[PDB]
Structures are given as C-alpha cells and as structure tokens.
Symmetry: C3
Subunit: 558 residues, 3 copies
C-alpha cells in the first residue's frame, strides 16, 4: 500500500480544479503546474503549491513531461494525476513517472500504447469478445468476393479504396462494384443513425474490474462531444450489461488499472461496436458520478494507493438521470471557431437542487488562444430525465457570459428542442437540426431599446458630490418642471445605434435591483438579467446576452 | 404524458410562495397573478413572471377565473395550480382550464362539485363503505319510531327539527320526545370529545391511490384549524389503516386524481365518521411532508404531467412527529378579529434542526383587510412528539412580530400547556382551556421599565458629528462628574407611561448586541429580544412583544 | 416519564458549549453557571441563562454543589448535566440533586462511589466476569509461595512491597525473591506494550444496556490522553465483542444508567484487563459519535427523561474511522506546563468534509491558570483510517494559535509520524518517539526573514490622509527614482532580531491576501499563513507559528 501526501495535477483549467477538489477532500495536498500564461490562473490559485513550467504553447508547456515530473519531485508530490488531454495517454510519460517512484493515477503504460494503435487494439479486442465494426481491408477482389464479404457485414454497407459508395441491397451490389478510377476496393459496414454509447470502466490493482453504467454522447458539434447523459436514454437492462461486460472484458484484456471508458457505437438495430478506449478519466464523467454518488477522482486516487474498489457490480448504483453540457468560447453562428478574448462578464448559476458546475474560470480571466476554450461544464441531475433537462435548462438561463462569443445560446436551444426532449438521438443530431439550433438575428424591437435604455440609465447613478451629498440634482430621474420626465440616451448595441428617448409622466415601467431588470409591460411583470461590467451593459434578451454601451460622439468622430 | 414549462399559481400569500418553491425545484418556471393591492407582494416578487388581475376584493381579483386563465395563456403557462381557498374547488373553473388546454393540478371537475354537495356526497360515500354520522331526516314520528332510530345511532344522541335536546339514556327518551313549539323532530348522533382526524389522500391518473398517513387538527379557534399534527397522537396501526382505506375508497369512489384529504371525526369510542373531503391540497400539508419526506406539490405536479405515484402503500413512510402552527394577524384576547395593519417588525426563527416555516410575508409588508390574515405556518419536526413540540415552541420564542396584534402569544401558550403535552385532544380544547390560553395583562413591574429604559437608551446612540467624530460627548453613558451616572427617560408602553430614571455608579447591569438585551439581575445573566424598528422599541417580556416609544411632550400637548 | 424544559450544565469550557448545543437541538433551554473569571466566557455567552457561582479557584466555584443546585432551582432548570471533571463523579452531588427533584444526567449515585473505590470495585468486577490485573497483596511469603502465584500471573511479572524488580523467567525468580531492605513482597503482573482500549457503555432506566464500540487512547503525555481513535486500529470483531460484553456486564453489575466507559488495557498478547470505569461521559466521546452517527448527549438527555435506548446491540453502527486530538495551552519542548495567557490569535479550520471541532474558546479570550488548559478538540472522520488521519492533519495545518505556547506543533508531528500511521500503538508511544515529537529550534534562515519582512511590510499599509486620500505617497512600495525599490525593516522574532533590507527591481516575489502569504521562490508558488493581530505578525513557518514584531528603538533603549 503506497500513500499520497501531495498529489500533483499535471493539467489546467476545469479538470485541474476538479481533481484538486477531491484531493483536498481527502486531506491530500495538491500541486499545480502552469505555463507562463496561466501564471495567474484559477487552478494555480486553488493549489497548495504551484510550479512554473514552460511558456505559452502546450507544445513547450504542459506537454513537457520531464519538467512536470521534475516539478513533482521538487514540490514533494508522491503521485501525478494527468487529467484528460495533454499527457494523460502516452506510456512514455507514464513510464517516466514510474522511473521516478511517482504513482501515476492512470492505466499501466502497457494498455496505453496498446490501445493507442488502431491495429494491435483491434487485435486484443477480438480476442476478448468485443464486437468490432465489420470491415474488409487487405484483399480487394471484383464482382464476386465482395458479395460474400458484404453479406455478413450487414447489407447497409459502404465501399472505400486506399486513400464512399453506400450499398443498400445485394441487388445494388452489381453496379456498386464496377467503379474504380483516379478493383482496389474495401468493404466497411455503414451504420444507420448510430448513438454514441460509452461505458465507464474502472478497475484496481487487485484484478477486480467493473463498469459504472454507460453514457450517451451523441450530440456532437462536428466531431466533439457537446452534450452527455447517463444513463443512455433508450437502452434497457440487458443491453446495458451486454455493453458493460464487453467493455469490462476489454479492460481485463489489456490488464487495465485505473479509470477509463470504452467508446462504443450502436445503430438503430441494437448492435454495438468498439471504436476506442480512453486510457484516462472521461471529460463527461460528472453525469456518471451524478447517477451513482461516486467520486471517480477519489476512486482514481484510492486504486493508485492500491486499495480495492469499494463495490461489486451488484452494487454499482444507477438512480435518476443527469445531463451534462460543455460551455465553450466558440461561436454559435460563426462556423464554430475558438473565440479567445476576455471574460468581461461571467456569472454562474446559483447552487440549487441537482445542480453542479465544474469550471476553471472566473470573471476577469482571459481566454487564451493556446488551450481548449472550455469555460465550464454544467451538470443537472433529476429524478426523471425531464427533470435533469428542465433543471439544466434553468442553469443555462441563470448563466451569463460577456466579452466573448459563447456556445451558450446554442446549448440553451438544444436542451429546449423538441427533438432532444423526445430523445431522438444519433450522432448526426447536430448537423440535422442546425436550422433551429443556429438561427439568425432580428435587429431587436423598439420593445428592446426602451428596455436597454431604462437599464443603462439606471446603472448610471448621477454623481453625489462630497460638496452637497443629498443634492436632488443627483437623480437619474429625468425630472422636468410641469411636463413629463425626459431622458434621452445615445445607445449602441452590437453594430447598431438608437437614440432612445425615455418619457414617462408615469414613474413606473422599469426598476432594477442587483442584476435583475424588473419590467412592467402593462399587466405583465417580467424580470431578466441586466449586468453592468465597466462601460458595458449586458442585457438578457430572448435567451441571448446583448452588450450595450453609450455612443461616444468624440471617440468615433475621431 | 403532457409537460409543464411554466406553472401558473392562481393564488397568493404563503401558499403561492410555497408552490412556487417546488416548481423552481424542478426547473419549472412560475407565473404569479395579483390584485392591485398585492402588486408589490412577496409572491409576486419570487415569481418569474407576474400578471395584474383585478383590484382589491377577492370577489373581483383572485376569484376572476376568466382573467386568471387568460393570464396563463398570455404568460405562457402550460398548467395551473390553484393552491387552497379561492378557486381551488369549483368545477366551473376546473372545466374552464380544460377549455383552454391548461393542465389543472387538482381533481377532475366531476369529483369537485360531487363532493361539493352535502347530498350526493352522502350518497357516494355510503356506496363505497365510508361511515357517515348516523342521522334521521325526512320522517319525524312521535314517541315510538325515534326509539328504534335512536337505538342504532348510539344513545348519546341529539334532537333537532327543521331550521338541541341531548338525549343520554333510552329512559330519558320519554320526555326527550314530547317537546315541540315555536312532532317535527330529527335524530342526529351526538359525538363525545371528538378528535378531528383527516387522511392525506393522493391519487394519479393511472387509477392508483393511496393515503399518506393522517393528521389531527382538533385544536380549532371557533371553527378554524389552529394547530395540526401528524401523526394523530393517539390512534395505532389498525385505526390508521382503517381510516386510510376508508378515505382511499372514498377517493376511488369519485375517481379522484390529485391531492386531497378526507376529513373524519372520531369520538372517544373509536368510531370515525366522514365530514367532507377537500378537493385541493390541505393547508396543514407540511406536517405530513415532515413525517414522510415527500414534496406533495412536486407530486401534485407530477400526476398533472401524468406520471404514476412513485410509491405503493407499503412504502408510504411515517417516521417521527411534526407539529404545525398557524400565525395570524388576529387578536388573542380581543374576541379573535382580523387585525389588518403594517408589519413594523417581523423576525422569523433561524434555520435549525427540524425547523420549517412557510410564510408569505416580510418586514414592511402591509396586512390588507381583504385576505386571510395568515402570516406564516411554523412547522417543527422531532423524533418523538415532545421533540417536535419543544422545538416548535423554541421557534415561537425566536419569532417576533410588531405593528399588529398577533395570535403568537396565544400559540406559545398552547404548545406550552400541560393539556396539550398530554395530548388531551378533542375539538373543544380551545374553548375549554381558554382561561389559561387568553389571560389578561398585569401592568408590568418596575422590574420591566428599568429593562425597557436601558434598552431604549442603548438603541439611541448619540449623534456623532462630522465636526468632531470622536467627541466623548456622544456617550449615551450618563456620565456625571463626581456623582453617579444619571439618565432620565420619558417612556410610554401601550397606554401607560413612566419616567424611568437610570442610576448606576456600577456601569454593569445591561448591555445590548444585535437584537438581544443582555441583563444581569445580580447573579442571573438572562437575555431577551429587544428590536428597534423606527421610533419604536419592541421588547420581549414574559412571552409577549411590547412596543415601547419615547413620550413626545409636544406631539401630545397638541 | 419526566421531561426537561431547561437543562443546567454544571461545567465550563468546551464540554459546556458541547452539551448546550445538543440541548438547543432538542428545543431544550440551557442554563450555565460561572466563576467570576468566566463571567465573560463563551459557554456563558451561548447560554440561554447564566448564573454567577463562586470566584476563581474551582475549589470554591464550579465545585460548590450547593450553589450549583441552588442555581438550577432558581433558573428553572429541571435537570443537571455535569459534563466531565468537577462534580460529574461523586454521589454526594448526585444525591443532592435527587434531594431537589432535579434529574441528573449521570449514573445513579450508587455506581458512582462504588466504582470510586479501588477495593469494592475490584469486588463487583470479579463477580461479573470482568478480568482484573492479576496481583497478590495481603500475603508476602519468601522463596516458594511466589513461584506458584507468579506462575498463574503470566511470567512477565513485577515485584513490589508496601509503599520494581521485573521478573522475566521462572529461572530468574530465584534472585528475584532474595531482595528486601530499606520478605514483605507483592506479585503484580507486568504488561508488555499495552494499548489503552476503553468501551463506550450506555444504558437506560429500563435495564437495557449496550456498548458503542471501543476507543483507543494509548498516546498519552505523561499520563493524560492526547490522541484518541475509534475504532481501536488493531483488534477485530471477536476481541471487540469480548471487551464490549465485559464492559456491559460491568455496568449491568452496579446497575448503571447513563453514559460511561470502561477503561481496559490489553498487552501484545490480547488479554484485556479492567482499570476503572468513568461514571460520566468521556472527553474523547466525539470519535465514537463520528463512527456511529449518534449524539451521546442527546441520548444522555433521553435516558434522563426515562426513554429507552433507540437501538439493540445488533444495530450499534461502526462505519469509517475518526481520530481526535486535544489542543492545549501546554508547552511542547517545555516539560509540558500549563501555559496560561491571552489568545492573541485563534483561527480554527474551516468546515470541510469529515471535519469537527469542539472548542470552548474564541479569539481574545484569556486562558486562566485555574482550569484545564484545553482549548479545543479537533476530530476528523474518514472512510479509512488514513483518511481520518490525513484530514485531521489538514485541520491542524489550517489551525493557528498565537499569544501562548501550544501543543499544536506537537500534535501535528504525531499525526505526521510514520510510527503513528503504522498504528504502532502502546501507552509508551509518547515517551518513546519524543526525540522526533519534541525537536529543537534552528534560528530560521535568511529564507525566512525575507518572507517575514515582506509579510509585515504588507500588513502595514501607509496612512491615507483625509487631506489627500489618493496620495501616491501612501505606497508601502519602496519606490525609488532611477534605482530599485528600497524598504528596510527592523524586525524581531522570538528573542532574535534582523534588519531585513528588501530590494527588488522586480515588483514580484510576495503578495498577501487575507491571512495568506503568497510567495514565489523562483518557479515555486507556495502559500502559508500570515496573520496580523495587533502589533504582532504571526507567520506559519515549517509547521510552527512564529510571532514577529517591529523593533522599537525607544521602548528598549529605555
């Protein structure tokens, strides 16, 4: 039994804070490492000790194993957690840790580069009884061998070469074959509306291994998990234990030790195929923890120390439903591009029932163009799936982010999409409903400018002079003698500008407390977000944060 | 399966906030509606969206169905919860909601007006095997038919006509009959020291139905529940399941769907009789939730959405004891009258163990003369009943309310009454011990004025002038040269006034921090409430809040 | 069934606050009593009512039964809890309470003075089948009787007289006997590396009795429990139930009622012997509560009221591990002496997972030379024992205490000692590893003074004058014209003084927020405690709080 006194977390952002929280929960000290850019980061801040690594690019910063392990030796860390990304999956680094006496909360180096090759991994998988996507490389016959090959591979089959021709019937296989240009043809099975189902595997040193239910990660933005959930909405008990056992046999196969997940893919027809196993902890791991009450990082730490998994498979719980969403600094209707800037506004959503949020940022922080733009992960748990969904949706309503372009408006729509409620999931969901997910702006109504004006005007007190502190002249009132209150504002939202003239012989209409604009459109009292950060007023309007500011005649004239 | 996005709560005060909290807990948006008087109310405040209805009287405000349903359509509510009171029990409104596509978290309109008639309800009840209070209308014979009738109705029987003559023995029935004036005689059973026991029923759409234990609501101020508890102190397992099944058969009878309770009545002899069923959620519902860990409003919402009750009767828990008390703006020793004014002081009691408080007010709020004067409901849970009682009592000690007359001093006495500890309950408890519950004032001792003075004097700093900020002249000290500290105060409590002269060559005695007056009556250091709100000092004295203020020679001389 | 309305706690410090918290948790009012010195104490502060007793020495203060019981009658207390120490174990006081109608949350007076005599207690114990340490008083033969006596007493035996000669073999017994001077010889069994294992017993009035697992309290500073844990690290199920039953039979024996523990002693050989039973609640009781989820004071209160223990022995839980440490105002490397002074600095460690802390002090409080110098008890719970240990260690890291000498540095070392992790426990542990537990100072490195200076300088702003509030002259910067920032400080730590000269053409290095000094020793960002209290700066350095202050040329020259 070894034992960690200080755990070094060789990573950054959300995940670094994430692991660090679990360490702390056990009385274990935490060590962070940072590039020069993250010198003033949150993960470095919440760390008991930090150590400066490289400079800016991950290439010569967080990827510098030798320095990371050096740091660990110097800062007195007895173990290393690599979190996901970076060096979490490359035996070289896993071995170098071994060649240092450092425990490595990960799978033994072997399993790593073994699963790192499409080849040998395809090998070990078949051996353990893990279904693989029927294919047919090597040989490339003509109008006769393919017929037999294709026949077993299920007929909804594809046709490639050596660098598509979707065959649907054996009767279409005829012309399907006589097509070669630019003979040499491959027979790879094509999958219909396939859901991405992975299984959370977790072993220990004592040969025990188990799967902690499965997660669906179908909704993906041009390859890249955007939403995750556990359990997988559709499949029942049998299908679960089938894929779980498969994954468990897959891990037993390469003698796995830590946490990792087997990433499958199952069509509309229930057949599930191995795609690849992640020899690290999964990003979307929170939804699993949600429905199981388990701290996978704690577990991750315990096996490292060499203890035995606290449960048997008959005990792995699975109650309720939890949905996870990834908040990025991407651009919704902007071809999704790593928008890196400054977080002028960043308000997370209050603690509340099944609410969880694993972030790595805070207001004022800069989103550098050197790392994954993931701001935070919002997770909601619910008894039913509607609950988790409706809760998660509320967490997205109560979250605002300004100073950057965010995939937040996008995510709000997804959870609030009839398609998503109905669980009509497959890995093409994103590109399918894109028209509803990535709309296009509507100039804003006079309904809006009045609201924005009121808001701004009320976020701009009036200057109280020490000379005369209670001067009625400090009113942002608009008071006029016999006529009605007049206030005129030159506002500019986005790349548009209006000259809102506020008039009201009726003091009512709008008020504003904290970060809430309380409006009264004759009869209906509604309240929305209105947050002032600097010379900017971020207003919540139709589920989209709009930045408003005053026009500066001088600035621009220049 | 339908599904609520926004839930409109067609009600106000405590219950409105109550339901709204559950909605929010599920990620469901909430819509409020208000009269013009409640335009600035707490329930409107804690609402995601509010809508102005009528004006002042419930008649043309919260009772205006057409507008309430209009509001719901306009504000985007997919369902309506009517809470208790108002329109929560009248098929007309329940149907109008149906004729709008709105889900109505309540029983189907049928059961409503069916149970709304003493007649037809008496019908359906007998049919389902629900005991009714033996009576004898219709026929009115003389000295012979009554003998047989009375004989079955149990002899402790009453005698009415067509608009009392308590018969106790068959041998007294003789003269009991020859009395008619102003022949036409009715034979209705009389009940001895009857406890009010109701059962919390809750069905769904799928025909399932169950009872969630029972509640005793015996202690009533001239008809009106004042205290409630669950479970009913006396009765055991058999009696519980008997009344429960009875109530469940009663609900199955009219095809009930939501939440509701069957209100029974059982004498000293264990026989229980149906009185009426409430086709809504019960006000005193918190004590039930307390001993069951169930959110009846959540459940209420779920059946509306059409899900199935999450439990079977073998699972309905029942651990511990919970007591509920109703805080009103009534007048203890003032013939109990709807005292409507301004809440100058309103301090609830800190969160603590089994403590719960469902209110609908806050300091500064006005208690209008248009609605039920219920301020809040204080609920305490305990393992035993003494625990709940002692805790609840502590919550009443730590609660202060000034600017109005309150039934709070009254309630404190009830929980602290030997009769109530001993569970000597029957529906006459209130009018019986009235002498101990509604005492009569004692002028206050010189013991008091000294205390009040010290308090006031210490709630009145001394004016620090910007001219000279640390001036020793700001001391509320009473400093005198060689003699002892002299301070004289002209105080007036209630309709009495004293000229407290504070002298002390001993700086000690009293001090005051926050809302606590710490006194030291030579040897005994005691601490009580002393809260300053405006030109008024509310002091806790002998379990009764006393308002104290300074006498104004000018004001009155005028 | 009697019932407490107000509970008087006849004690002080931590335990008084401790019991008072449980009372409050049940809605039970609490009454405190104090000496004149504790007139402004925390336990008196957290009390609903307090009563002045004696003056300074416990002799004529908390030990004055007559006054304590008088107080209880006067303050309206229906019961008395004596906590540990003082009068918690002396039938005289227990009887006097009886002769007053006061419930006494303790064992019936009988058991008290019965267990109070080494004699009669040795009697009752043998009768109930409770092993005792084999001895041999009365008779004192020569070279023949001892041989037989010694033979049964296990040969690792001692030899005393009437006021040591450790015999190890029967073959050594020869010369072992012919030694008498200054015949009259006693034969008492000697124990090898004995662990101190006591069992938490708890009965009621209804004859039921049970043991709530055991606690190990081996690590003791020259007789005096310093560390405690539950369960006892080594022993298994059989040994547990054996000692438990023994203790239970011991309590049944004298007809015990409340809480108490049987203090055993078991050698390396597994044989356990009775030492004495405490007829009160144990100080170290929190570790037991930790691993059982039980409030022993609540229980203590309930049996007093005459209820029946809520569990059977098959239910007494035992999950996880909890370690308790006693924080005293002793002197680590100062021959352990009751250091009584003023708590200039007292910061407990934040609420966190298995964290618990039962204290009786607060910053500013004076540690009088009249009572047990125990500041607080820090308890950490963990799933495994390493967890509890590592957590508890973190609680000791996050705890600072200045203005006195504290056994805190000592305790930190114990939990962080390889010997303690390995559970190498026996009652000699303290005096054995003393060399590692009570080191000796090392003057502090230039590494330190730079740190202390920076800290001090940064805890000393610069004086902002109302005259000119933003004056750049307020910088504690060290700004110099063309050269580098110069700041010179005359600091004095302990009885040493340096003239730290801070120079930095690099603004970086140190910063300071809250009570954290964030340092950057080129590459490694570390953070430690630095708390300013008055003209003193308490810095955390190498797990030892160092007091630093500025040298005053005038003060000393004088």
């Amino acid at each position: 039994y070894r034992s960690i006194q200080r755990l070094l977390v060789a990573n950054r952002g959300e995940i670094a804070c994430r692991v660090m929280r679990s360490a702390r929960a056990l009385g274990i000290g935490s060590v962070a490492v940072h590039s020069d850019i993250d010198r003033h980061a949150r993960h470095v801040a919440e760390a008991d000790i930090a150590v400066d690594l490289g400079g800016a690019k991950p290439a010569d910063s967080y990827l510098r194993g030798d320095r990371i392990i050096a740091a660990a030796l110097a800062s007195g860390a007895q173990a290393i957690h690599p979190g996901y990304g970076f060096l979490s999956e490359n035996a070289d680094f896993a071995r170098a840790c071994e060649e240092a006496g450092l425990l490595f909360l990960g799978p033994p180096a072997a399993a790593i580069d073994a699963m790192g090759s499409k080849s040998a991994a395809k090998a070990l998988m078949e051996e353990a009884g893990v279904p693989l996507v029927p294919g047919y490389h090597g040989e490339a016959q003509d109008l006769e061998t393919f017929r037999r090959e294709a026949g077993r591979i299920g007929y909804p089959v594809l046709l490639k070469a050596a660098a598509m021709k979707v065959v649907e019937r054996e009767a279409e296989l005829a012309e399907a074959l006589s097509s070669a240009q630019r003979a040499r043809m491959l027979v790879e099975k094509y999958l219909l509306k396939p859901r991405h189902v992975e299984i959370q595997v977790f072993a220990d040193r004592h040969g025990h291994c188990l799967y902690l239910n499965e997660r669906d990660c179908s909704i993906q933005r041009r390859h890249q998990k955007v939403v995750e959930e556990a359990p997988a909405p559709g499949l029942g008990a049998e299908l679960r234990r089938a894929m779980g056992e498969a994954a468990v046999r897959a891990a037993q196969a390469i003698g796995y030790v830590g946490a990792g997940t087997v990433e499958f893919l199952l069509d509309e027809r229930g057949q599930f195929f191995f795609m690849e196993m992640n020899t690290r902890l999964q990003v979307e791991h929170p939804v699993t923890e949600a429905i199981t009450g388990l701290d996978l990082v704690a577990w991750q730490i315990r096996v490292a120390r060499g203890e035995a998994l606290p449960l048997t498979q008959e005990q792995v719980p699975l109650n309720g439903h939890a949905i996870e969403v990834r908040l990025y600094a991407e651009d919704p209707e902007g071809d999704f591009l790593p928008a890196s800037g400054r977080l002028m506004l960043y308000r997370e959503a209050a603690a509340g029932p099944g609410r969880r949020v694993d972030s790595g940022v805070r207001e004022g922080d800069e989103v550098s163009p050197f790392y994954d733009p993931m701001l935070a992960k919002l997770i909601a748990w619910g008894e039913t799936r509607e609950e988790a969904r409706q809760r998660l949706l509320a967490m997205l309503a109560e979250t605002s982010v300004g100073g950057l372009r965010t995939n937040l408006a996008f995510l709000r729509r997804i959870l609030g999409h009839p398609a998503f409620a109905a669980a009509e999931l497959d890995t093409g969901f994103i590109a399918r409903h894109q028209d509803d997910l990535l709309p296009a702006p509507q100039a804003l109504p006079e309904h809006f400018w009045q609201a924005a004006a009121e808001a701004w005007l009320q976020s701009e007190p009036g200057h109280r002079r020490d000379d005369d502190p209670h001067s009625p002249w400090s009113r942002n009132d608009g008071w006029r003698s016999a006529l009605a209150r007049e206030s005129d504002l030159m506002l500019r939202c986005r790349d548009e500008r209006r000259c809102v003239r506020l008039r009201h012989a009726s003091p009512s209409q709008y008020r504003l407390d904290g970060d809430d604009l309380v409006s009264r459109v004759d009869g209906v009292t509604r309240r929305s977000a209105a947050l002032r950060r600097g010379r900017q007023l971020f207003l919540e309007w139709e589920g989209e944060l709009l930045a408003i500011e005053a026009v500066d005649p001088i600035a621009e004239a220049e």
